[PDB]
């Protein structure tokens, strides 16, 4: 029932550029007053496109999305991670777990990517503590319940890095299980069955997505014993075999080889025909774009100087820092067509002003007349 | 001499999940009943689906699995395998045996899909103690007999890891030689040359595999030799040399790597025609579904604190789980066409409710529309 | 709060039927979790686990004296009750009841304990 | 007593004592908890660990312990009169099938 013309309009930013800290925000020692901002290639970009009223509706017929740095990879870790011993290769049986036994401990992420475009919030799922406390006591200790949780995704929400989709921060209590951007975080994953099932398409029209992963190393952990081996399994052993050794082991992940072939942005969609009964119609004048790349994701170390006046090196004469660069372009067209999420926090980007009919002097609008 | 016809019906679950550990089930020390359940990505998944009688028959034309769950690589290990030493490089000859030389050891699996679809329960074969007895005497710790098995594959049942397709069981008394989740159990492999064979198809009128492994590491046993190596193929040595080091060589699978653009999920299937004489009709109005999907076994671990009265880090203040999140979500095509097993474990499915002909407000129905 | 007492026969002779009766306030054996046990404590001698029952009603004994124990209990009223056979005078013992914690370990500890009722033998 | 400990020891005021627990693979090896009691001459258990360290409401922070293999640890610190009781470790046995107590250790005091 909605009527296309042969009206075009190209929109877009040509610049969006952040800069912050990868790991952690900066902040006075306990003031919650934050000075420098946390900023890395695991956190969801959900942009709120708030376009111009046309009736003073829209149809996102293609978008692309521009990435400017350079190729890398990221690093992240754990000063105190919870890693007892290396099990790949044993060659001698453990011996002591003793009180404290975490290591400084570093490991890349899954490589991943997606591009995520509608007229509503996109919808991520994660594992978190359940609800039902029904008749059952929670003793000192016990395995806390699990639930499937649906949220809404926000800017600056962490992304699936291969420990799984979860709510890091109850299910977890000792912080020590997963590197330090993620120890107090939620690592959401989009659910897309509830996201393409909703039957009008409006939480997206559109989506890619493109994952890897490989274990880089095998890790045990140092914690009590919850639920125990079985008896059956294993015969008891005696002398150095007397004590079991612990049988949760957690992976390492690698997300391999980055390459240029293998990216999705910095390339042009056609938004045709959609998955659902929305054919991309912009309800409300709005729009979100979720992206993730973890395939830029390099942390350019900075290095300065405290004094000048010491004729050797001296580790005490410099300050390291990390920062990570986040640059973004996006552009849009949008085709004319006839007939209470002030709770989150999203990148608003206005292009009330930047709309012009003249495609050819855009590349997005040369690709488009091309195509 | 079955009639087809234009009518068709959508259907499907919308979701099942399940959740629980991923190497024993739980229970109370000597009680055999199950406080939480086994699941793991190695474990087959056979949907029983209970399709409406059309008379108060059916013919399967098409197909979904949706898998939920973010990507990653489960881990297994056993904190008593048996590993004499690592043979890959040894720079010096292998001094001491002992009593009890067994290590703990992990390893990630054997990558491995499937997804068999039929209206008879599939077939598994797996490599059994013989039954011939005859007139030979079974002498202390003689080799058992081996004897190619045939069974039906239930919900429950392990894959193959890359050690064999072989009853765990009672061929390996130890329970040292395979890790835990599969020490006492029985990792069976789909018995394809069969299931073609049967010229009426209804054991599976479409089936998929993408499976791949590589050696990561080289490994010895320690027990007592059997069948010894012949004085012909070797040189007897002396001093270091004098005793020989065991000759019993195992490999360490490992899956490589993950990736979406290698899935067989999350994407329709069309059975307009079948490899065998039935072309897709559910005779008794039956389906099994069984699916095996390694590229989502990501354990994640909880941690629970005891006790918040410690100012410092204490391994005897947080108790260690794990857990495995299972998601699937079933669709299905069905056309319409006009003219015993209640030992086993399967996943009941009931779909005498859930059938529509409105093909538009699903997304499988969609895309069959479009094809 | 919590708390248990003990009651029962201070004297029994040999060869008889021992019959001991606890009541606990506080919690119920209905909970998920709630467990409660017996254990003996003969003079100058160690402490020895006997009996333990939980909310399912699943009943555990020791094996050395696992056919002379059983034991039941009844929601309703709150109360647990032991029967030990076949006596003799090595069981001259204290008897304290106790709750118990369920763990998905199996290493159970019990917190609070009762009193204790002396039983002799003779 | 499966689990076995020593028949006594003893300590200076203030002075940090030890205590021991040895098992074996079937009930501290495998992995089953360990927990601690004291009782006081003429007086029921009264729990004091529960999971080779934690402290239940009630105990002062002097009391911890940990976990050394086939055997675990109570540390007392800042031995007092208090400390004149009966301790007993407590764990689970797969073998006999049974939860197991120890000999018990007499903690005297040289005042």
């Known amino acids: 029932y909605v009527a296309r013309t042969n009206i075009y309009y190209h929109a877009g930013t040509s610049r969006l550029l952040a800069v912050g800290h990868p790991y952690f925000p900066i902040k006075k020692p306990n003031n919650n007053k934050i000075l420098v901002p946390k900023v890395s290639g695991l956190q969801y970009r959900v942009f709120r496109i708030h376009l111009p009223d046309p009736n003073k509706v829209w149809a996102c017929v293609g978008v692309e999305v521009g990435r400017g740095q350079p190729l890398g990879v990221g690093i992240s870790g754990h000063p105190l991670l919870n890693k007892l011993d290396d099990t790949e290769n044993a060659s001698a049986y453990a011996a002591n777990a003793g009180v404290d036994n975490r290591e400084c401990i570093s490991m890349d992420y899954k490589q991943t990517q997606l591009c995520l475009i509608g007229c509503k919030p996109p919808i991520g799922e994660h594992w978190g503590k359940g609800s039902p406390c029904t008749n059952v006591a929670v003793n000192p200790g016990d395995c806390p319940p699990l639930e499937l949780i649906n949220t809404v995704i926000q800017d600056g929400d962490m992304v699936d890095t291969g420990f799984g989709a979860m709510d890091f921060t109850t299910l977890q209590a000792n912080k020590s299980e997963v590197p330090l951007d993620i120890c107090t975080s939620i690592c959401k994953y989009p659910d897309y069955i509830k996201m393409v099932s909703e039957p009008y398409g409006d939480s997206l029209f559109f989506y890619l997505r493109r994952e890897q992963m490989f274990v880089r190393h095998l890790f045990n952990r140092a914690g009590t014993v919850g639920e125990n081996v079985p008896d059956d399994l294993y015969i008891k052993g005696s002398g150095s075999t007397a004590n079991l050794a612990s049988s949760n082991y957690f992976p390492t992940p690698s997300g391999s080889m980055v390459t240029s072939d293998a990216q999705i942005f910095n390339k042009p969609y056609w938004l045709q025909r959609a998955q659902g009964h929305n054919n991309g119609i912009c309800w409300g004048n709005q729009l979100f774009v979720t992206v993730v790349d973890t395939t830029r994701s390099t942390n350019m170390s900075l290095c300065a100087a405290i004094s000048t006046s010491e004729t050797t090196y001296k580790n005490t004469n410099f300050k390291e820092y990390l920062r990570h660069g986040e640059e973004y372009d996006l552009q849009f067209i949008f085709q004319l067509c006839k007939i209470p999420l002030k709770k989150y926090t999203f990148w608003e980007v206005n292009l009330k002003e930047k709309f012009s009919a003249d495609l050819d002097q855009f590349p997005l609008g040369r690709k488009f007349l091309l195509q | 001499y079955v009639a087809r016809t234009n009518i068709y019906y959508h259907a499907g679950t919308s979701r099942l999940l399940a959740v629980g550990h991923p190497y024993f089930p739980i229970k109370k020390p000597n009680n055999n009943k199950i406080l939480v359940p086994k699941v793991s990505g190695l474990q087959y998944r056979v949907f029983r689906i209970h399709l409406p009688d059309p008379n108060k028959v059916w013919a399967c034309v098409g197909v979904e699995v949706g898998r939920g769950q973010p990507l990653g690589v489960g881990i297994s290990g056993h904190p008593l395998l048996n590993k004499l030493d690592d043979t890959e490089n040894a720079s010096a000859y292998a001094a001491n045996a002992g009593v009890d030389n067994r290590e703990c050891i992990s390893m990630d699996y054997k990558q491995t899909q499937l997804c068999l679809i039929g209206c008879k329960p599939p077939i598994g074969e797996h490599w059994g103690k013989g039954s011939p007895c005859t007139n030979v005497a079974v002498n202390p710790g003689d080799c058992p007999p081996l004897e190619l098995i045939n069974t039906v594959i239930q919900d429950g049942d392990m894959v193959d890891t890359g050690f064999g397709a072989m009853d765990f069981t009672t061929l390996q008394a130890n329970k040292s030689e395979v890790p835990l989740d599969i020490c006492t159990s029985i990792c069976k492999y789909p018995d394809y040359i069969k299931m073609v064979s049967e010229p009426y198809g209804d054991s599976l009128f479409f089936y998929l595999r993408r499976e791949q492994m590589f050696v990561r590491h080289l490994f010895n046993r320690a027990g007592t030799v059997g069948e010894n190596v012949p004085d012909d193929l070797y040189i007897k040595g002396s001093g270091s040399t004098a005793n020989l080091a065991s000759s019993n060589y195992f490999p360490t699978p490992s899956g490589s790597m993950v990736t979406s653009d290698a899935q067989i999920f999350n994407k329709p299937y069309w059975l307009q025609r079948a490899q065998g004489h039935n072309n897709g009709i559910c005779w008794g109005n039956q389906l099994f579904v069984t699916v095996v999907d390694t590229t989502r076994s990501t354990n994640m671990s909880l941690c629970a604190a005891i006790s918040t009265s410690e100012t410092t880090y204490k391994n005897t203040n947080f108790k260690e789980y794990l857990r495995h999140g299972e998601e699937y979500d079933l669709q299905f095509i069905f056309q319409l066409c006009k003219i015993p097993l209640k030992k086993y474990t399967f996943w009941e499915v009931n779909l005498k409710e859930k059938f529509s002909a409105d093909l538009d407000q699903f997304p499988l129905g969609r895309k069959f529309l479009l094809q | 709060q919590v708390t248990l007492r003990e009651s029962g026969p201070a004297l029994v002779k040999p060869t008889q039927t021992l019959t001991l009766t606890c009541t606990f306030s506080?919690?119920?054996?209905?909970?998920?979790?709630?467990?409660v046990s017996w254990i003996r404590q003969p003079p100058g001698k160690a402490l020895e686990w006997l009996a333990l029952?939980?909310?399912?009603?699943?009943?555990y004994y020791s094996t050395s004296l696992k056919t002379r124990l059983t034991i039941s209990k009844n929601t309703s009223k709150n109360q647990v009750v032991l029967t030990m056979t076949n006596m003799d005078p090595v069981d001259t013992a204290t008897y304290y009841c106790?709750?118990?914690?369920?763990?998905?370990?199996?290493?159970?500890?019990?917190?609070?304990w009762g009193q204790g009722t002396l039983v002799t033998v003779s | 007593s499966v689990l076995t400990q020593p028949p006594s020891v003893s300590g200076a005021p203030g002075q940090r004592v030890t205590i021991s627990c040895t098992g074996s693979?079937?009930?501290?090896?495998?992995?089953?908890?360990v927990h601690w009691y004291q009782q006081l001459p003429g007086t029921a258990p009264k729990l004091l660990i529960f999971?080779?360290?934690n402290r239940p409401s009630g105990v002062p922070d002097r009391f911890s312990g940990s976990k050394s293999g086939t055997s675990a640890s109570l540390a007392i610190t800042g031995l007092q009169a208090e400390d004149e009781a009966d301790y007993y470790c407590?764990?689970?046995?797969?073998?006999?099938?049974?939860?197991?107590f120890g000999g018990g250790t007499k903690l005297t005091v040289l005042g």
């Open positions: 106790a709750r118990t914690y369920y763990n998905s370990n199996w290493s159970h500890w019990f917190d609070p």
């Open positions: 506080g919690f119920s054996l209905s909970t998920n979790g709630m467990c």
């Open positions: 029952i939980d909310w399912d009603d699943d009943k």
């Open positions: 693979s079937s009930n501290i090896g495998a992995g089953y908890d």
């Open positions: 999971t080779y360290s």
């Open positions: 407590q764990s689970y046995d797969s073998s006999l099938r049974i939860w197991v």
